[model samples]
Target: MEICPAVKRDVDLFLTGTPDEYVEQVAQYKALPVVLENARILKNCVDAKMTEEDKENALSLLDKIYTSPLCVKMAETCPIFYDVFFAVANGNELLLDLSLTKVNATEPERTAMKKIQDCYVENGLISRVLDGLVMTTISSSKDCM
Candidate 1:
């Protein structure tokens, strides 16, 4: 299924629209059926048995959807976003043959994590949203968040 058009529409409606400093509010009236077909695209790519070439193209498209501001507020609309990202990068059936980067969720694997600390405390839906995401990222006990 084509996801680009839907992703663009969602990005346009969500992030393209004005954002709260934290997660933006969507009235029940407004939120019910905003265009969100990103998971569909991911599934389509998987179904298509996406190739390296496909990965490259998909990356560009996926970047737009993933890096969007509203996309960051994903515990509700796309709870599986975090799960799929880790699985794809690590060892999921979808990309197992592709041999993408297989790094531990640790400092050496993600060395960039060693530096920079978040100076402020948490707030809003983001703080709570991350609770679930971070949990999905765990093996046993670690700050993979």
Candidate 2:
């Protein structure tokens, strides 16, 4: 498959510079869609697993990439990080709920969280039965007693 020239530039920039620098270049180019698509493609490749050494580099690069605030916000909106995070945790409901609950989220991040929540609710990624559980307060006065 032929990679987009914008993708090549973005990848090289990200490799040679800090995540923030890469973000600035991405914004300057207005190539967010292409960059994101390249990320998704790389994700698919990683999902399929890779050679040991090659895979390590890929994972390391992805970690750096996701640390960018821009990518973090994109993942919040896309919700791929949410799912992949919980996947490592064995798909724990508590983890999913915690991410959805959102503490210290920025205004734009909050909007992304809301969108993801709605999408998860609609898609059954977060079961309706467990929806209230996340918000429920379960405590007893036994400590004082």
Candidate 3:
């Protein structure tokens, strides 16, 4: 697995491609297939009573893949360019939330929270493309802290 800095340029490149193209790109450089294979292997090793260090290494690799910059950025922007991309990808909403911080966390935190919320609102825009009910409500009120 490789960990690289994900920039807006990379996101633009992925968005320019088709769904199949995006999947192919992910399958190739991302080593998603290999990551899945490793999961199965690690499971089997657990059944055989592998050492904690060995198991930890496998789990660490899995975390690396799941937290890769490419994957994180995809979760952020997929809701924009392609609606189905988020649904088909699964767990994107949760991942996007996880990728962000609370509303009033920090300076960088505020920026990231705003970005994620913007993505959420954009996802709501394409609600028809998404499954289940879509509720669009706007409320403008102030709460004193």
Candidate 4:
């Protein structure tokens, strides 16, 4: 599978500069499954034939979701992880877009990216559920303590 031209460009842009520099740059964002979900939903909506106003409304919803207390608390407590989460989400979005483009199924990069994106979406769902469980456990433990 070949890398989609657009995804390759975004990855290149993301990898620009030293790895350490990139890691440090992402340290300020909050990482959460909701962000990935938001990206996926937005990308999907954009793929659909929605009007500009509809798209804007979807984006507004994303903003609200990201800024909600659960997400904000996670970001404040774990900014570095959040940054990594955003990086992954951004990359996943690019890969998903590329997958929808017409490309040869035999190409290694394209095939690999497609599989990776599928895993990203699947794993994200599982992770979100597990995260909820963990949060509940932690909250319960805190109450007991």
Q: Which one wins on TM-score?
A: 4
In model 2, pairs of residues that clash are none
Candidate 4 residue lDDT tens string, 33-112: 55434434433423343344443443343233344443345524323223323433444566444332322223433333
Across 4-107, the per-residue lDDT of candidate 3 in tens digits comes to: 22322223233334444444533333344643343233223233442444334433332443455544556342222223224323335554334332211233
Which candidate order results from sorting by lDDT in descending order?
A: 2, 4, 3, 1
Candidate 2 lands at a TM-score of 0.23
- 1 or 3, which is superior by TM-score? 1
Q: Per-residue lDDT tens digits of candidate 1, residues 112-138?
A: 111100101112212222222222322
- Summed backbone clashes in each candidate are 0, 0, 0, 8
Q: Would you list the clashing residue pairs of candidate 4?
A: 1-107, 1-108, 1-109, 1-110, 1-111, 2-110, 30-82, 31-82
Per-residue error (Å), model 1, residue 135 = 8.5
Assess each prediction's global lDDT (C-alpha) against the native. 0.29, 0.38, 0.33, 0.35
Model 1 worst lDDT run, 10 consecutive residues = 113-122
For residue 107, what is the lDDT in candidate 3? 39
Which residue pairs collide, candidate 3? none
What is the TM-score (0 to 1) of candidate 1? 0.23
